[PDB]
Design an enzyme around this catalytic site. Structure first.
Site, mmCIF file in Angstrom:
data_model
loop_
_atom_site.group_PDB
_atom_site.id
_atom_site.type_symbol
_atom_site.label_atom_id
_atom_site.label_comp_id
_atom_site.label_asym_id
_atom_site.label_seq_id
_atom_site.Cartn_x
_atom_site.Cartn_y
_atom_site.Cartn_z
ATOM 1 N N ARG E 80 76.363 66.442 49.640
ATOM 2 C CA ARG E 80 76.905 66.178 48.318
ATOM 3 C C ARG E 80 78.409 66.271 48.300
ATOM 4 O O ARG E 80 79.070 65.414 47.730
ATOM 5 C CB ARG E 80 76.303 67.104 47.271
ATOM 6 N N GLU E 83 79.592 63.084 49.614
ATOM 7 C CA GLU E 83 79.355 61.979 48.700
ATOM 8 C C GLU E 83 80.397 62.000 47.606
ATOM 9 O O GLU E 83 80.896 60.956 47.155
ATOM 10 C CB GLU E 83 77.969 62.089 48.090
ATOM 11 N N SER E 106 97.145 69.324 52.520
ATOM 12 C CA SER E 106 96.823 69.918 53.799
ATOM 13 C C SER E 106 95.473 70.597 53.746
ATOM 14 O O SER E 106 95.125 71.206 52.723
ATOM 15 C CB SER E 106 97.892 70.931 54.186
#
Lengths: 138, 135, 138, 137, 138, 138, 141, 138, 137, 138
Positions: E80, E83, E106
């Site tokens: 997830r 995604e 960073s």
């Protein structure tokens, strides 16, 4: 690798072994590395040439599951691959023009590799041309 | 491909073109396929040999993007790849023993390809051995 | 790694080892990591410099398989790869213009790496330019 | 590429363009190749240096998507990759010992490339060391 | 990494508790115990102190670890997050470009924090240094 | 991209548009980039805010095929991915211990992104925790 | 797999176990395979149902690192994957039209699998629909 | 997509079309998306139901080159894939026990999808069980 | 595909075309699909058999870059691939035992495909066995 | 492989074993290679035919996780793959025309493999045709 270790002990080169046995140097090397196999009579002779017992001749006779060592990242090997990435389409074209629609076999194939004067690597590949089936009905 | 089409029209073989221009057959072929380049004077001569105009000669001179045609699945090409999958470790071992710790260059390299009697494909590769830096 | 463990025990830096042995720091480091090899006389000297026995000198001499440690995901290494994804075409163009049609060799190559004033990482790569074959017959 | 074509017409080297504009040669080259961008005032100056109209200065200013040209197979580029496959772990170890636990940035980074006597390619990379966060509250 | 975790489960310690005892960021500490990050030797001794374990293990916590190489992509919890940046990546890119300029956030100088809030929602706060791209100056 | 071009003309920031429309900045940005959609009434209002004609509001209303822009190589985006490679297992462990066996949704999720006083990128993700089904019947 | 071996010894079907324990068949199966976990009281009961000692109940309680068994090449499983390659866009379209812009959860999800008359495999999946976030500002500003 | 555009104009749902034509809703949807085909009589009827001319009917009759739309990254689709990553081995075991050594066909297969009373997505798949060949000479 | 469209117009089956031309059905089909080529005299005859002009005979004669159509996901094709995933090692073993150390060529190879009395798909593959090199010199 | 080793000792061919047990040769071979399984009574018989103990009969009865041996690079196997890369679309077309819209099953499938008089490899595959579901509500 039991065969390679035995070879190093004796101070034998792959060249020397090939000349003693009257066989192609690259092929023999591939038998010892387990990418190819020989008949039992050559297997016994290999064993004698090296230090080892005739009980190991069986391993040299077994057909192997070939082409499956991950060696793509070795710089020496990559270069051969790069070479066909660059000249592949050219070789394809030349072979089509000069032999016809087919391929060069990797199965019926004699490699030779040689240091020549000037210390250049000379790799000679000698393969059967197989033409593609042309649909003939008998 | 404008060059290849021109070559087919004239009935020229790659062999013939190479002998007329006094260059390596495989290299020249690769120039026409855009995997290699030549100097301007050869470029004009190529154009001169082929039907085509000298305005084309520029394309043969451009360094071309190299090694990026997805031809891996062509059976003819696959076989060369299979060949080094099978004999790669052997070649590696032989070259180490007979030259030392290095590689055979793909840059300083002369390919040659030939039909010999008995109709076998004979492919000869002639490359510089470069030893690894040793400290 | 038996070599690295030995080095840490003694409190030796890669810099120090290189200066004692009169060799390139990065190359020596790569020998110890097994991505490069040395001759037997340097191997014995490496062994003396570290705690270890001269029976391990053999491992440093064997030509290894190179470039096959799956370290792509390490952030420090990724950065170098990203660097050539971003500037690659630029370096290609500059080298073509200033040297000609060829490449910079990774084989005949001297890396050097240094902390400069301001604590910046200064990596210097010094490689042979190899021009492509230009089709000459003789 | 409309910029590269313009450069070739004029017979300009990347070296020459960099010295005229007082900028890093490799960086400038990357701006022209669309892997980096500049401010509008440099963009106008690039346009004059080349044959081209200022109307193209906009393209040099837009931040592009970076690192996405599939050039891995070019032999010249592959070599740099191979180089870090072979010496990567060594560089990692040396940097750890001499700087500490961190990385060398690819963002704050000055490349320089040079033909030295003997015709060797000399590439100098000058990057900021960033240490890893150490958990301080 | 598991050995420390095993020691933590025995004692009934939460990652939260350990972090508060040691006065360090919870997520970073957790990553040290999982071997994706390292600490100095003083903190290492204290970690061993908090857990059941002997000081002789403090060394493992100090070694710079080979990071980002655990194949956890298929875990649904982890997928997830991936995604999420597939969907909002270009938006975050655009916002960051507009509000900070041409650079990046960073992953090295970065403080993660993760929290259950009222309403039982997962609140993940990431706090990173903005690094601008080099602008060609001398 | 017709929407982004329209936004640049007017000199509008994503921040400004979000505040005018009373919606989440990152979500709105994603609607304009075609990784998310809105209802027709917001779509009309977006069109008014920008230069553009209402007729075009339908494109903002279509459900789009998400997460399919190949942006993995952009350094800014890579860093977020590297971040979950390094801290992923830690986040998984913390979430398990503090919420239980489940995941943080990428669907019911509010991203927020901010430049703070220190000019640090502050990325806040606020997601629903969904516990795994526990086998209960009707 | 210690649990599966124990189940085969007793001649128990997954159906039988599920009915005795009053739980979803597929979920229980997944617990035994280590792709899901249960509470300690069910774990003890599973152990009794099988031959095994209550001492093993702990393993059934640990949250597992899921979805990581490389089974893609098994023909049976590949078929389900092919099925969503072929009908995926259709399901996407139907769900969008009938529920809205969202997804069907794989987390809050009840699988059921059945041999019906005519010996056909009948696989019923019952998932929560989660709509996408629609940009609503929180209470703050 | 010429068919989908036509459907949207008329305000028809996939449900409605299926009811009118007395066919499975999911299968019909797939015919319109070009992952399946129908006979010419149904094709003519589809054309009448939509605005369109009978000439377009042939496209619905051509066997399509299936399963080749790269939709893996869509979150809605990924979840179905995740679902079989997690429960795959369980389904495998149950099917083996209750049907025997075989598979459930994706070819002879009836999908159905439904919103229930609880507003839950209910997906019913009904497939032929094919047992593996058992080596019988007859 | 210009050839396939022409075939569908005439109501010709691949079987019929093969029998008219006295060639292997599967091979001919592959020529029309552009995974194989023929000589010019057959090419002209193919054109006559279909509706089309002899100006298209050239395309049937060009050697084509084979095996590069991304059809792996088609269920019909996948099945053949799965079949060699499952029985590959068995076929390898049988062929080693009964022919020796070699391979069956995909180049010198006659496919045939047939509906039998029981309405079963019967695919027959007839290939040359090539033994591996012996090391002779 | 414990079965294959046992077979080689006895000097049995796959043909002989199949003739003795009254089963399909290729199928039996696959059972020995662990890509298929048999009932317990055949498993015992296989064990007797070979040297081995009846305690190994269990392994032959377990349904195996099929199609997952990484043998793609073996030249013998590659050729079968290449064959369907070249003729795949043709077979697809022929089967569509002569059987309809469906597939040939790999599950209900009888392989046979044979050396003929001219020493050509003759591979005969005999599979069930399964037509696709055509959307019928009955």
């Amino acid at each position: 690798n039991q065969f390679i270790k035995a070879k190093e002990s004796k101070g034998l080169t792959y060249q020397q072994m090939a000349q003693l046995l009257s066989v192609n140097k690259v092929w023999l090397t591939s038998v010892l590395h387990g990418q190819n196999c020989c008949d039992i009579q050559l297997a016994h002779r290999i064993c004698d040439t090296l230090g080892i017992s005739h009980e190991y001749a069986n391993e040299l006779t077994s057909i192997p599951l070939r082409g499956n060592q991950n060696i793509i990242n070795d710089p020496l090997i990559y270069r051969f691959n790069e070479l066909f990435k660059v000249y592949g389409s050219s070789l394809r074209g030349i072979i089509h023009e000069e032999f016809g629609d087919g391929i060069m076999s990797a199965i019926d194939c004699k490699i030779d590799v040689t240091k020549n004067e000037q210390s250049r690597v000379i790799l000679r590949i000698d393969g059967k041309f197989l033409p593609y089936y042309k649909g003939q009905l008998d």
